Amino acid sequence: GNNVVVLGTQWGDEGKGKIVDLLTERAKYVVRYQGGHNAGHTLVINGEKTVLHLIPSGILRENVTSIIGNGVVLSPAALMKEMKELEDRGIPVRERLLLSEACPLILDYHVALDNAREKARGAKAIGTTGRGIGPAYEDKVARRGLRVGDLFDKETFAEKLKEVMEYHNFQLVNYYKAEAVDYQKVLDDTMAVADILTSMVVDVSDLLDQARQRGDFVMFEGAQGTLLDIDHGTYPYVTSSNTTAGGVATGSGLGPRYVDYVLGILKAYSTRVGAGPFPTELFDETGEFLCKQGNEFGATTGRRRRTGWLDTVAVRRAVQLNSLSGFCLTKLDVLDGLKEVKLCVAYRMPDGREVTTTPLAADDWKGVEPIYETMPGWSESTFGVKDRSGLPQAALNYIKRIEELTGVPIDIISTGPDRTETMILRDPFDA
């Protein structure tokens, strides 16, 4: 329909960016509704590689306005850095972007609290991106945080900023025994971008309701993935926002009765960055092969993605939590050449019990062992294939089995990192 959601079905890095950039060809708006710059979406258009974080993946398209919904926690620092890079490449960011004055703000003290809490978690550290996302979300629900809107009044922004920092620095210095964050610096840094931000503000919910009445095509871009949802994820190894489809209404202001189609991105195999249960993790040659072939290295120490077999027990759970209406299989080609492929269809509980639904809290996962279904791999290359008929039987069978186990059709198939290396079986805007 008009309103199509694009979220990750696993633990992030499913290939959301690419898919949004692809389908936005038909959208009037693309909307980010949760998370922050902890997200990293790489795009490759005809060879050119663009990496975004905070800015929505529809930015490289003209005649498509990008909106950062109130669900997004916003770092003006990161937003700046990200605007200049594209503005440099010749992308007219300032002209295609719009913000919601309801976005909380991530400031220096959040990144600091984030690092402090992680070092304090010690061995049980989460594996945070270190961008101050959780801290920002914490100030928000605690009703103490600043939001873009707060910048309309430079004078008040100052008064409020002082109280909040007073509280946080007390935490840091006295409790985490850490360096205090300089109030004046932050005040200055922020005040200097205050006018860039406030000028891109728009009442998003009103806008989204209008577009709904005109029939505009809206594409909501999710970040992270279903199993990192603060509620339904593998708490506490999870991100602090709702990554599931419900966060679209919550983080954008669009009534829930208005989501028309929910596209779940499904990477052909599993990965996980950070700590957390992963029943399907590989520590062998295959595990090695998937990483080298997937090229999931990270931006830095600790962002080297873990790999493993596609987990259908966990996917079926992303199916119900999101009322998915279609899957988009990405990275099918990373499996090329393997002798046999495998997919988890049940979990064997420590007590011998074989279940088909996933546990909730991370502790509840501690002893599950996957129960796979093994099937033949394929030697021929699937990389770059644009036609279905050009896919090897074994590959097509892998696809069909995913469709039988989950009950959801696979509508789009990505066969390469390029925007053009894709097969659109059924367009979400057409259903």
Two structure tokens written together for 372: 């796979």
* 67 sits near a second copy (criterion: CB under 8 A): no
CB of 306 to ligand H5P, least distance (A): 10
Per-position x/- string for 13-52, each x denoting binding to a second copy as judged by CB under 8 A, each - no binding: ----------------------------------------
**Binding residue count for a second copy, defined by CB under 8 A:** 66
According to the annotation, is 129 in a ligand binding site?
Answer: yes
Nearest-5° angle of CA 47, CA 53, CA 56?
A: 80
**Nearest residue to ligand H5P on Cβ basis:** 274
By beta-carbon proximity to a second copy, the closer residue of 337 and 407 is 407
What's the CA gap between 89 and 85, in Å, rounded? 6
According to the annotation, is 364 in a ligand binding site?
Answer: no
* 174 sits near a second copy (criterion: CB under 8 A): yes
According to the annotation, is 233 in a ligand binding site?
Answer: no
Residues in the chain: 431
Question: End-to-end alpha-carbon separation of the chain, Å?
Answer: 6
* 246 sits near a second copy (criterion: CB under 8 A): yes
Query: Of 21, 37, 41, 114, which one is the catalytic site residue?
Result: 41
CB of 270 to ligand H5P, least distance (A): 12
Q: How many CB atoms lie within 10 A of CB 396?
A: 14
Q: How many CB atoms lie within 10 A of CB 339?
A: 10
Within 13 Å, how many C-alpha atoms sit on residue 217's CB side?
16
If contact means CB under 5 to 8 A according to the sort of partner, which of Na ion, a second copy, ligand H5P, none does residue 297 touch?
none
Two structure tokens written together for 158: 């100052």
List CB contacts of 321: < 8 A, sequence separation 6 or more: 226, 229, 232, 244, 245
According to the annotation, is 358 in a ligand binding site?
Answer: no
CB of 40 to Na ion, least distance (A): 4
Within 13 Å, how many C-alpha atoms sit on residue 288's CB side?
2
Decide if 13 is catalytic.
Answer: yes
* 337 sits near a second copy (criterion: CB under 8 A): no
What's the CA gap between 50 and 326, in Å, rounded? 26
Decide if 206 is catalytic.
Answer: no
Catalytic residues: 13, 41
Binding-site positions: 12-18, 38-42, 129, 143, 224, 239, 299-305, 331-333, 414-416
Binding-site positions for substrate: 299-305
Binding-site positions for IMP: 13-16, 38-41, 129, 143, 224, 239, 303
